[PDB]
Amino acid sequence: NKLHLRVVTLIEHPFVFTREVDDEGLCPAGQLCLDPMTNDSSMLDRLFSSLHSSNDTVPIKFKKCCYGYCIDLLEQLAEDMNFDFDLYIVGDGKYGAWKNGHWTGLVGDLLSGTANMAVTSFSINTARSQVIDFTSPFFSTSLGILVRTRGTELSGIHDPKLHHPSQGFRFGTVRESSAEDYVRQSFPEMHEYMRRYNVPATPDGVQYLKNDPEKLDAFIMDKALLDYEVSIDADCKLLTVGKPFAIEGYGIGLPPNSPLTSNISELISQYKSHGFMDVLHDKWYKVVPC
Fold first, then answer.
1. Are residues 203 and 224 both part of a single domain?
2. Where in 187-274 does DSSP place strands (E)?
3. Angle between helices 261-273 and 276-284 (to 10 degrees)
4. Where is glycine bound in this sequence?
5. 49, 70, 190, 274: which has the fewest Cβ within 10 Å?
6. What is the sign of the dihedral through the CA atoms of 63, 68, 73 and 76?
7. 3-state secondary structure of 179
8. What angle do CA 250, 269, 83 make, to 5 degrees?
């Protein structure tokens, strides 16, 4: 009667966060997940088998507690579709792209049968959709540009400051991000310019902007993520600038022609129409005074 799934995720605030497990090895207010840095389904199998057994030998460093907007969404889908799940963090930290004759990241794990579903801030695009299923989007956003107060001002992606940058203007994105993919296709000169300034992960871009003085002048990523960073910055020193560009949607990813896809899209429609997605938004995007 009750199905068991393995779900893969990717840490991206405020959709998915991790904190450490408690003294008991438990996750109050979170979901136990593993962070084993592997794309090997046989390794994941043996780790989860050990985790559920009377002889749990899983390295304690692999155990984390996942929480966030998408974890709340996953819990609701699990209730409504009557499944429980194992949760792990994608080993390479990537959403997925075609590299060296294969798909990386979440895409790769879906195609190889290593995960049943991918739940995070997963940007739907044509390339990925040719090989995996996406549900209807549970979140709609766009690209944006994060800057420092009294620093760089931009009208948006078509500002001359970005297209023929002043020498030494430092702007970048996370390598292999949705922003990188957009700029590569739309503005090849800008894509090459940014290579010098791109960073390994979202927290790096944010931290570099928060440095006094800043180590980066502008950071291009999904606005949903950047607005979250602005909302929590204690000093109100960050802001997003410019008009929205590169409309994006987040969907749940499944293997191609999955029998789950239509069921999840229907539930997402209901959650939207009956106010649940608004509840999650208000929960994770709190207004906190400067």
1. yes
2. 218-222, 238-250, 253-254
3. 80
4. 121, 123, 128, 178, 222
5. 274
6. positive
7. helix
8. 80
Distance (Å, whole) CA 37 – CA 91: 4
Resolution (A): 1.7
What technique determined this structure? X-ray
Distance of CA 97 to the CA centre of its chain: 14
Kindly give the interhelix angle for 261-273 and 69-81, rounded to the nearest 10 degrees. 110
DSSP-derived 3-state class of residue 253:
strand
- For the chain, how many residues are written? 290
At residue 6, φ and ψ (nearest 5 deg) are -110, 125
Q: Is the peptide bond before 14 cis (omega within 30 degrees of 0)?
A: yes
- Annotated binding residues for D-serine: 123, 128, 178-179, 222
CATH number of the domain where residue 229 is located? 3.40.190.10
- Residue numbers belonging to the annotated binding site for glycine: 121, 123, 128, 178, 222
- HSE (CB half, 13 Å, CA atoms) of 5? 23
Nearest-angstrom CA–CA distance, 126 and 169: 32
Is the domain of 135 the same as that of 152? no
**Rounded distance between C-alpha atoms, residue 59 and residue 82, angstroms:** 30
CA distances from 206 to 50, 120, 169, 214, 238 (A): 37, 20, 16, 10, 9
Pairing state of beta strands 83-89 and 3-9? Answer: parallel
- 129 and 260 assigned to the same domain: yes
Which segments are annotated as binding site?
121, 123, 128, 178-179, 222
Same domain, 130 and 199: no
Same domain, 113 and 228: no
The rounded distance, in Å, linking the Cα atoms of 167 and 126 is 35
Please count the structural domains in the chain: 2
User: How far is residue 56's CA from residue 24's CA, in Å, rounded to a whole number?
Assistant: 13
